[PDB]
Design goal:
It is classed as hydrolase. Keywords: Hydrolase, Glycoprotein, Glycosidase, Membrane, Sulfation. The entry is titled "Crystral Structure of the N-terminal Subunit of Human Maltase-Glucoamylase in Complex with Acarbose". The protein: Maltase-glucoamylase, intestinal. The chain has 14 helices and 51 strands. It is an alpha+beta fold. The protein has five domains: 39 residues, Spasmolytic Protein, domain 1 (Irregular); 238 residues, Immunoglobulin-like (Sandwich); 349 residues, TIM Barrel; 99 residues, Golgi alpha-mannosidase II (Immunoglobulin-like, Sandwich), CATH 2.60.40.1180; 138 residues, Golgi alpha-mannosidase II (Immunoglobulin-like, Sandwich), CATH 2.60.40. The strands form ten sheets. Strands 41, 42, 43, 44, 45, 46, 47, 48, 49, 50 and 51 form an eleven-stranded mixed β-sheet that branches. β32, α10 and β33 form a beta-alpha-beta unit. α10 runs parallel beside α11. The longest helix has 16 residues. The chain starts with 16 loop residues before the first helix and ends with a strand. Bound molecules: a molecule of 3 linked components (GLC-GLC-AC1), a molecule of 2 linked components (NAG-NAG) and 2-acetamido-2-deoxy-beta-D-glucopyranose (2 copies).
């Protein structure tokens, strides 16, 4: 074969002819760098035995192992293929052991399919028998999307592999990793996935979460597809320039979904329709969050809070890290250093702010009659810990408080215990949201305080290239035992089960409210429950650059509320870096400045009351808050439809191949282009301006650039923000908290396209009740402008905000002078508004107007 198509037969060691021969593979060392010297032969694997059988849902096939050397042990002789034409755009196939039940992910959202093959498929499936392969092609153009024929199917108990050709190199996704770029390097790269507490740095290791989804943009027409593997065992994904991708996992089953869409966004919508769309956040979670590890005392925390409030920083949320606890134990506070914590909570609340508390899964096991630790006693009484391999002894590890046991969040009763612990603590400290951390789960000892037994779970025949090369490193023994199964199988599901339990707890502690959950470890579908942050980064320019692809990727995974620690967790942050990162950070969907222990303060007001950093931070945060109605509506669409929030340029501009690798800029939704300075010393940025009309956000002037690379001038106080022609942006006068800003006058920004038309929408509900979308208690309105006329149209009208909200300002960009501006209500005029016009900038602002939110209006003008 073409060397780019070789599928490596020796993933586990340096390639030798002797091993190649024993494995029945092909040997050819004469390739280029990273081209496998030993690769699978053309007929190695499985063949279809007999006929495929039609089922109501699709078909099944029996696959029989063609005689083969047992490399990673216990091979599976009879494999069952079950294929289901689940929807017109989603294909599901699974390969199981015909004769034995194997571990399958007990996902909380995904259900087994019952019912019949879908009509009007956008795809076709083709099965080859001798040797087995499966191919999924797009019906419209016969483009081959998934094609396993490039390599073997391998299916041993602890080694399962399938490959697929890909129709392009525009591949985005997989996680959790620092990829450094957004479009994948298809040049022989292997990405291990196994939830792990480690530093998101340049080493390309497995990190906190496990995300097997990827999306492929087929060509400039926008046609795209995506693939998801429902498997929670350690795995790695191998990318090569064929182009092709190989999944290699060490247990469970190969359970694949293939999704087709007409655009990249439609693929994401299809993926999220399957795994679970993201929670609609509390509107307050959209504001700016502040945090650090080790304020040390409530006095220190209060001083930080107070200087940022004194500076009028938009600032909704304060996080309290493990320093609030009594000796780093959950569900206590330090009665000396945090004496008066409940009074401080009241102060936060009186100022319109929210408290988010960190909670760790591990529970101190140090409790006596003399000094009881309630959470451990109650947990032991309920028998809800993760056990050792004997199945009866709670496993002992070590985390922040010292020796600890670990809750088994897969046990339904564990959620009852967890809920009661939060109820009890909420009675003392009235926190508003929960930050779940260390939930990979992270262990300061490897496996347990007594290590791990040598066995096939702790020491498997094949180990993907995870950091440190052992599964149990900085986590639990793989033979530890939980309600859903052994840690070997469910390790990647710990943070997911914990988020599910935590949301369950919120039902009791925050009745009928969304609250906020922020989680470190994630699995596919975690976004239904929680926000995410990109973990323990560093105050470097590299970390700032690497943040954007990480944010875009999590939006693909349906965790749109995601961001890094702005300014950098580890290390003292330089002023210039923190200023640039604050500017960018004002536009991360989850915007939090957080800092590690002992490092110099990096909260915005710490740089000085009159500093450039503070001024610019406040400035761009005030822009974020102004655009919160737009951001919120983008979250409404992510929740209800499955759209991304932070979005790659290529999701909107896929026709333009110059956007396919852009990862130094991004969009909010379709209409706002963010262009940060990402280089030390720079007052410029080399940026791409897509094929659209664009307007400078602050001045409203139309840029001359279109569909081209530019050097954008961005001095130390600026970040690029441009509005897309053809879009209408709802705004609301900002205040330093969202409690307050939500009572303010609204505005519209109408950015006219080349045809002097534009469209937009606004979702509005109470900002905090759970299920307002499912129960249809909300306002959705639509704005459109087509020559001389803005129409405000109400499509859903079941919530009326009691604060008398109205649009009191309309700003029109790219317009000739309007004249004779008329306002009609339900067709009835209806008042002559005030119009200000800038003939140099071609901007009109209409004021002295009061268009009540929830009412239909026409605003008309002449030229
Ligand atoms: C607070 C943090 O502590 C732990 O991580 C720290 C490591 O223990 C240190 O070894 C050091 O890591 C360095 C690596 O060893 C080195 O290989 C290189 O990559 O640089 C690293 C530093 O950049 O520093 C680590 C912290 O930077 C622990 O493993 C980690 O999970 C902890 N972070 C969480 C805990 C808290 C405190 O409640 C929160 O504040 C954080 O946001 C959590 O993410
Ligand atoms: C971990 O071990 C404990 C025992 O230490 C198991 O607790 C059992 O729980 C069931 C259901 O709650 C009770 O009916 C039994 O009486 C408990 N056994 C004992 C010996 O008390 C628990 O099931 C274990 N967890 C897992 C995942 O196996
Ligand atoms: C990679 O990891 C090592 C620890 O093994 C660390 O010291 C180093 O800084 C990392 N390198 C990069 C490029 O991030
Ligand atoms: C902003 O909120 C404060 C409460 O902190 C309130 O006093 C004030 O009236 C609000 N002002 C605005 C922006 O209209």
């Amino acid at each position: 074969v073409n060397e780019l198509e070789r599928i490596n037969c020796i993933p586990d060691q340096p390639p030798t002819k002797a091993t190649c021969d024993q494995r029945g593979c092909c040997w050819n060392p004469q390739g280029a760098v990273s081209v496998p010297w030993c690769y699978y032969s053309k007929n190695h694997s499985y063949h279809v035995e007999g006929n495929l059988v039609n089922t109501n849902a699709g078909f099944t096939a029996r696959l029989k192992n063609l005689p083969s050397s047992p490399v990673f042990g216990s091979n599976v002789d009879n494999v069952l293929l079950t294929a289901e034409y689940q929807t017109s755009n989603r294909f599901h196939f699974k390969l199981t052991d015909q004769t034995n039940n194997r571990f399958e992910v007990p996902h909380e959202h995904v259900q087994s399919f019952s019912g019949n093959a879908a009509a009007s498929l956008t795809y076709q499936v083709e099965i080859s028998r001798q040797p087995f392969s499966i191919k999924v092609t797009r019906r419209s153009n016969n483009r081959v999307l998934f094609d396993s024929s490039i390599g073997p199917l391998l299916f041993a108990d602890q080694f399962l592999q399938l490959s697929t050709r890909l129709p392009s190199t525009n591949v985005y996704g997989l996680g959790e990793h620092v990829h450094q770029q957004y479009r994948h390097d298809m040049n022989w790269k292997t990405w291990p996935i196994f939830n792990r507490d480690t530093t998101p740095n340049g080493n390309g290791t497995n990190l906190y979460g496990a995300q097997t989804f990827f999306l492929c943009l087929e060509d400039a027409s926008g046609l795209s597809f995506g693939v998801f593997l429902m498997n929670s065992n350690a795995m790695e994904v191998v990318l090569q320039p064929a182009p092709a991708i190989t999944y290699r996992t060490i247990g469970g089953i190969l359970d694949f979904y293939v999704f087709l869409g007409n655009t990249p966004e439609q693929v994401v919508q299809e993926y999220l329709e399957l795994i679970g769309r993201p929670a609609l956040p509390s509107y307050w979670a959209l504001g700016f969050h502040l945090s650090r590890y080790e304020y040390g005392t409530l006095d220190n925390m209060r001083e930080v809070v107070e200087r940022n409030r004194a500076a009028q920083l938009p600032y909704d949320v304060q996080h309290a890290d493990i320093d609030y606890m009594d000796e780093r134990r959950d569900f206590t506070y330090d009665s000396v250093d945090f004496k008066g914590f409940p009074e401080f909570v009241n102060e936060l609340h009186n100022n319109g702010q929210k408290l988010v508390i960190i909670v760790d899964p591990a529970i101190s096991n140090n409790s006596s009659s003399s000094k009881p630790y309630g959470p451990y006693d109650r947990g032991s009484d309920m028998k809800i810990w993760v056990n050792s391999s004997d199945g009866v002894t709670p496993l002992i590890g070590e985390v922040w408080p010292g020796q600890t046991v670990f809750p088994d969040y897969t046990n339904p009763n564990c959620a009852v215990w967890w809920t009661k612990e939060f109820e009890l603590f909420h009675n003392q400290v009235e926190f508003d949201g929960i930050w779940i951390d260390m939930n990979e789960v992270s262990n300061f000892v490897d496996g347990s305080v007594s290590g791990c037994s040598t066995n096939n779970l702790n020491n498997p025949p094949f180990t993907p290239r995870i950091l440190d090369g052992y599964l149990f490193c900085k986590t639990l023994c793989m033979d530890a035992v939980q309600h859903w199964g052994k840690q070997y199988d469910i390790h990647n599901l710990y943070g997911y089960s914990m988020a599910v339990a935590t949301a369950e707890a919120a039902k009791t502690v925050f009745p009928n409210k969304r609250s906020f959950i922020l989680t470190r470890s994630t699995f596919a579908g975690s976004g239904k429950f929680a926000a995410h942050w990109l973990g323990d980064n560093t105050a470097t320019w590299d970390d700032l650059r690497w943040s954007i692809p990480g944010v875009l990727e999590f939006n693909l995974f349906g965790i749109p509320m995601v961001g890094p620690d702005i300014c950098g967790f580890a290390l003292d942050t330089p002023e210039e870096l923190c200023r640039r990162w604050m500017q960018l950070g004002a536009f991360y969907p989850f915007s939090r400045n957080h800092n590690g222990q002992g490092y110099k303060d990096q909260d915005p007001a710490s740089f000085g009351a009159d500093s450039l950093l503070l001024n610019s931070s406040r400035h761009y945060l005030n822009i974020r808050y102004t655009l919160l109605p737009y951001l919120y509506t983008l979250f409404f669409r992510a929740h209800s439809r499955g759209d991304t929030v932070a979005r790659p340029l290529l999701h909107e501009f896929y026709e333009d191949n110059s956007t396919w690798d852009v990862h130094q800029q991004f969009l909010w939704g379709p209409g706002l282009l963010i262009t940060p300075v990402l280089d030390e010393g720079a007052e410029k940025v080399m940026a791409y301006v897509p094929d659209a009309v664009w307007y400078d956000y602050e001045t409203g002037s139309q840029v001359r650039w279109r569909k081209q690379k530019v050097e954008m001038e961005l001095p130390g106080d600026k970040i690029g923000l441009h509005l897309r022609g053809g879009y209408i942006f709802p705004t609301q006068q900002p205040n330093t908290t969202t409690l307050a800003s939500r009572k303010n006058p609204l505005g519209l920004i109408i950015a006219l396209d080349e045809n002097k038309e534009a469209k937009g929408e606004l979702f509005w509900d109470d900002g905090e009740t759970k299920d307002t979308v499912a129960n249809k208690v909300y306002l959705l309105c639509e704005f459109s402008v087509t020559q001389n006329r803005l129409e405000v149209n109400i499509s859903q009208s079941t919530y009326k905000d009691p604060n008398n909200l109205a649009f009191n300002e309309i700003k029109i960009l790219g317009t000739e002078e309007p004249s004779n501006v008329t306002v009609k209500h339900n067709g009835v005029p209806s008042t002559s508004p005030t119009v200000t016009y800038d003939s140099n900038l071609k901007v009109a602002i209409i004021t002295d107007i009061d268009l009540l939110l929830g009412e239909a209006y026409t605003v008309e003008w002449a030229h």
